[PDB]
Design an enzyme around this catalytic site. Structure first.
Site, PDB file in Angstrom:
ATOM      1  N   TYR A 163       0.818  -1.234   0.000  1.00  0.00           N
ATOM      2  CA  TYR A 163       0.000   0.000   0.000  1.00  0.00           C
ATOM      3  C   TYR A 163       0.870   1.312   0.000  1.00  0.00           C
ATOM      4  CZ  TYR A 163      -3.047   3.776   1.253  1.00  0.00           C
ATOM      5  OH  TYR A 163      -3.605   5.015   1.346  1.00  0.00           O
ATOM      6  N   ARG A 169       0.629   8.955  13.067  1.00  0.00           N
ATOM      7  CA  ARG A 169       0.243  10.186  13.697  1.00  0.00           C
ATOM      8  C   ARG A 169      -1.245  10.447  13.511  1.00  0.00           C
ATOM      9  NH1 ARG A 169       2.204  15.027  10.371  1.00  0.00           N
ATOM     10  NH2 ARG A 169       0.383  14.193   9.194  1.00  0.00           N
ATOM     11  N   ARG A 185     -11.718   6.211   7.906  1.00  0.00           N
ATOM     12  CA  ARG A 185     -10.578   5.592   7.197  1.00  0.00           C
ATOM     13  C   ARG A 185      -9.761   4.735   8.138  1.00  0.00           C
ATOM     14  NH1 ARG A 185     -11.087  11.000   5.784  1.00  0.00           N
ATOM     15  NH2 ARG A 185      -9.791  11.639   7.534  1.00  0.00           N
ATOM     16  N   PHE A 202      15.750  19.553  -0.089  1.00  0.00           N
ATOM     17  CA  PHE A 202      14.409  19.094  -0.431  1.00  0.00           C
ATOM     18  C   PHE A 202      14.133  17.676   0.146  1.00  0.00           C
ATOM     19  CE2 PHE A 202      10.469  18.469  -2.632  1.00  0.00           C
ATOM     20  CZ  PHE A 202      10.525  17.377  -3.485  1.00  0.00           C
TER      21      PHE A 202
HETATM   22  C1  D99 Z   1       4.235  11.080  -0.593  1.00  0.00           C
HETATM   23  C2  D99 Z   1       4.159  11.620   0.857  1.00  0.00           C
HETATM   24  C3  D99 Z   1       4.376  10.467   1.820  1.00  0.00           C
HETATM   25  C4  D99 Z   1       2.798  12.265   1.150  1.00  0.00           C
HETATM   26  C5  D99 Z   1       5.343  12.527   1.148  1.00  0.00           C
HETATM   27  N1  D99 Z   1       5.251  13.947   0.688  1.00  0.00           N
HETATM   28  C6  D99 Z   1       4.823  14.968   1.466  1.00  0.00           C
HETATM   29  O1  D99 Z   1       4.449  14.756   2.587  1.00  0.00           O
HETATM   30  C7  D99 Z   1       4.822  16.416   0.940  1.00  0.00           C
HETATM   31  C8  D99 Z   1       4.806  17.372   2.172  1.00  0.00           C
HETATM   32  C9  D99 Z   1       6.092  17.264   2.971  1.00  0.00           C
HETATM   33  O2  D99 Z   1       6.960  16.460   2.628  1.00  0.00           O
HETATM   34  N2  D99 Z   1       6.233  18.038   4.083  1.00  0.00           N
HETATM   35  C10 D99 Z   1       7.167  17.648   5.150  1.00  0.00           C
HETATM   36  C11 D99 Z   1       8.190  18.778   5.267  1.00  0.00           C
HETATM   37  C12 D99 Z   1       7.537  20.168   5.229  1.00  0.00           C
HETATM   38  C13 D99 Z   1       6.009  20.107   5.434  1.00  0.00           C
HETATM   39  C14 D99 Z   1       5.358  21.481   5.364  1.00  0.00           C
HETATM   40  O3  D99 Z   1       6.068  22.618   5.520  1.00  0.00           O
HETATM   41  O4  D99 Z   1       4.147  21.588   5.170  1.00  0.00           O
HETATM   42  C15 D99 Z   1       5.378  19.223   4.348  1.00  0.00           C
HETATM   43  C16 D99 Z   1       5.632  14.318  -0.636  1.00  0.00           C
HETATM   44  C17 D99 Z   1       4.591  14.526  -1.555  1.00  0.00           C
HETATM   45  C18 D99 Z   1       4.905  14.869  -2.903  1.00  0.00           C
HETATM   46  C19 D99 Z   1       6.234  15.092  -3.246  1.00  0.00           C
HETATM   47 CL1  D99 Z   1       6.634  15.621  -4.920  1.00  0.00          CL
HETATM   48  C20 D99 Z   1       7.280  14.871  -2.319  1.00  0.00           C
HETATM   49  C21 D99 Z   1       6.968  14.503  -1.022  1.00  0.00           C
HETATM   50  C22 D99 Z   1       8.093  14.355  -0.047  1.00  0.00           C
HETATM   51  O5  D99 Z   1       8.310  15.678   0.508  1.00  0.00           O
HETATM   52  C23 D99 Z   1       9.421  13.886  -0.594  1.00  0.00           C
HETATM   53  C24 D99 Z   1      10.469  14.826  -0.753  1.00  0.00           C
HETATM   54  C25 D99 Z   1      11.714  14.391  -1.186  1.00  0.00           C
HETATM   55  C26 D99 Z   1      11.919  13.042  -1.487  1.00  0.00           C
HETATM   56  C27 D99 Z   1      10.892  12.120  -1.348  1.00  0.00           C
HETATM   57  C28 D99 Z   1       9.647  12.560  -0.926  1.00  0.00           C
HETATM   58 CL2  D99 Z   1       8.324  11.380  -0.778  1.00  0.00          CL
END
Ligand code: D99
Length: 335
Positions: free
Chosen positions: A136, A183, A193, A253
């Site tokens: 998943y 979380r 869900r 990033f």
């Molecule tokens: C797919 C996923 C598990 C939802 C992960 N995910 C997210 O949670 C996006 C939001 C996020 O990370 N925050 C954490 C740090 C700052 C927070 C904020 O200030 O709000 C938000 C995510 C979603 C889409 C993309 Cl393009 C990238 C990610 C990941 O950041 C990621 C980055 C680099 C390499 C691999 C991955 Cl997986």
């Protein structure tokens, strides 16, 4: 530089919101290719998450989503989720997709094909085994890590290994996804869900909703600790993954979400409040993590400090206690 790329960045800031800056700091061609991948994933997620689309309509949508990227007219006008604008104005996003270098389009399209297949397969089922949980998470998160890794390699800002080592990239996504799922136990329960794996929760209680009742709080925390212990198993891969990155904007990033998940897991560990509300790291703590996470020694010191904290918090009677100490020991020593 364009009319509809400005609306893409607008959407990027709306849905996000503080993470937008980290994306916009990516070097060269990575900025647009990651930004668009982000928006495309937000549109796919909005389709998957929408309870008002019947399974018979949703399955073709998920399957064919990768093809809609290549269809200038395609849109979806009937969604009840928050970010529904990404779907209503998909033609703008898919126009920007089609302006990317083909080497980035082909990554994104292939990842969306594979994610759509996986998401469609889970519309019926809840997650049973820990192996199903990983399948998943691969579909909804681990393939995001994979896709991003291939953008990094294809842009040539990172070595081809980053893009090829699917298992380290998959662990990057799984760590973040399992952290969120852990979380979000209560708000997920609220919204009908269920993501915690049935094989693990059913060793504690008869129904997953039962962890919200006061009399089960001790069983709930044991299960929480056991799932947290599972998530920590990805950290050696996360360290290997981040240790290979040579581009600064790519490093920041990738590292920022991982140190935030680490601090979140430490906050949740042995924490009753997971079952009463939303455990979150303080804004100022978040800001400081973001500023510090810019090189491997500082990321590894953040990891070790939070793991030691968890380590010293482990109750001797916790049923996962020696699994928790073993993975923490591995992370520390296998430096
Ligand atoms: C797919 C996923 C598990 C939802 C992960 N995910 C997210 O949670 C996006 C939001 C996020 O990370 N925050 C954490 C740090 C700052 C927070 C904020 O200030 O709000 C938000 C995510 C979603 C889409 C993309 Cl393009 C990238 C990610 C990941 O950041 C990621 C980055 C680099 C390499 C691999 C991955 Cl997986």
């Amino acid at each position: 530089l364009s009319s509809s790329l400005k609306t893409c960045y607008k959407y990027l800031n709306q849905t996000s919101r503080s993470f937008a800056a980290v994306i916009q700091a990516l070097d060269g061609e990575m900025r647009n290719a990651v930004c668009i991948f982000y928006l495309v994933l937000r549109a796919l997620d909005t389709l998957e998450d929408d309870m008002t689309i019947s399974v018979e309509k949703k399955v073709p949508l998920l399957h064919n989503f990768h093809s809609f990227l290549y269809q200038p007219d395609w849109r979806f006008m009937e969604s009840k989720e928050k970010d529904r604008q990404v779907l209503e104005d998909f033609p703008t996003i898919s126009l920007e997709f089609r302006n990317l270098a083909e080497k980035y389009q082909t990554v994104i399209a292939d990842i969306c094909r594979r994610m759509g297949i996986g998401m469609a397969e889970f519309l019926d089922k809840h997650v049973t085994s820990e192996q199903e949980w990983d399948k998943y998470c691969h579909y909804v998160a681990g393939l995001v890590g994979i896709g991003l890794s291939r953008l990094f390699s294809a842009s040539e800002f990172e070595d081809p290994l980053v893009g090829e080592d699917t298992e380290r990239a998959n662990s990057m996504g799984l760590f973040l996804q399992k952290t969120n799922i852990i979380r979000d136990y209560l708000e997920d329960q609220q919204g009908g869900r269920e993501f915690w794996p049935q094989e693990v929760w059913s060793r504690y209680v008869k129904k997953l909703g039962d962890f919200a009742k006061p009399e089960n709080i001790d069983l709930a925390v044991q299960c929480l600790n056991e799932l947290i212990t599972n998530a920590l198993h990805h950290i050696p891969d996360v360290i290997t993954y981040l240790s290979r990155l040579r581009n600064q904007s790519v490093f920041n990033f990738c590292a920022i979400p991982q140190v935030m998940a680490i601090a979140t897991l430490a906050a949740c560990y042995n924490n009753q409040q997971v079952f009463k509300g939303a455990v979150k790291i303080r804004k100022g703590q978040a800001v400081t993590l973001m500023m510090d996470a810019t090189n491997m020694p500082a990321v590894k010191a953040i990891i070790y400090q939070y793991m030691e904290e968890i380590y010293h918090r482990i109750p001797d009677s916790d049923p996962s206690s020696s699994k928790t100490r073993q993975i923490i020991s591995t992370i520390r020593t296998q430096n």
